[PDB]
Amino acid sequence: AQYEDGKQYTTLEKPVAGAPQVLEFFSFFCPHCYQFEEVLHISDNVKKKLPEGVKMTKYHVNFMGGDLGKDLTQAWAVAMALGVEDKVTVPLFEGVQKTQTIRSASDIRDVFINAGIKGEEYDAAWNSFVVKSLVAQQEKAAADVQLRGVPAMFVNGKYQLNPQGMDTSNMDVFVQQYADTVKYLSEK
Secondary structure: OOOEEOOOEEEOOOOOOOEEEEEEEEOOOHHHHOOOHHHHOOHHHOOOOOOOOOOOOEEEEOOOOHHHHHHHHHHHEEEEHHHHHHHHHHHHHHHHHHHHOOHHHHHHHHHHOOOOOOHHHHHOOOOHHHHHHHHHHHHHHHHHHOOOOOOOOEEEEEEEOOHHHOOOOOOHHHHHHHHHHHHHHOOO
């Protein structure tokens, strides 16, 4: 076939009931995730091809960057609660991997302040039980799917994208293939 299990995607041996339709995992410490966000715009190009009615979820993971990794997972929770994902994603990536100016929770906080979230609003979110459950959600979802690597994308809790099996001579062609694969899995 044109799309084959084990080539553009793999199938989970242990399917995950009730899982989000399109579920992406990343880490701000993850170099391909940096590429995926800033150079390739994967999430965005996937949205653009997804059918009507499909929601898109993105979660941060703990298993990279130790203590700071965990802080970043809580900050991503804050970003989700406040709806400011689109304002912090780029400065966080660059703060961790480009300029290396993020070394502590306070430096993470500064990115939000500079993006214009109020301190009081950030610290209140940071400490909120709504954010605690949001952190739990991120961890549970990664837990439900064996997760030891990022970037990662899962569709309908049963299929996992396999970008290793796509041509990367051309970045644009890679993205479209990736997105079309997600659309194909979505319709399955």
